Amino acid sequence: MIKVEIKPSQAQFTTRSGVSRQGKPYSLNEQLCYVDLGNEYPVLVKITLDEGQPAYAPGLYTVHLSSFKVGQFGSLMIDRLRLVPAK
Template identity: 45%
Template sequence: MIQIEIKPSQVTVDERRGTSDKGKDWVMREQKGYIFLGGDYPELIVFPLAEGQPPYEAGLYELTEKCFSVGSYHSLRFSRAFVLRPVTSGK
């Protein structure tokens, strides 16, 4: 199981807005956290939030199945959706 920890200082949304070359407005909403990949220390990551989605609260989370998709030629890839599930104390 891949775990992500969100610290109290990371319960914020970084939002950027702009206009594309074609005149379409865009918004990027992101939050930071730490991912545990088996090394001595976790790695800082930035992940997307859906429009209107509040930031995740501080705590431990795991990646859900919605974070992945199968691409062309059956390759595993990250999907645009990034949904975390709280880790319960029984895990």
């Protein structure tokens, strides 16, 4: 479990439907690169939704280390480029 600090500056959240788009069944809601853990201020870490997750909480959120399928995919890639767990 890792923590992120998705600031409200770009914390837009659009509820995703079952099928928002034939290509992408769920809408994307990415914010910025923020993590509550690192050298000091939010390090550069995005909680890439990757349509596998919705936007959650503005300001502060947590990007699970297991914020991706492990073993089932083998990679934390499912929709697009994803960042490894912050630490």
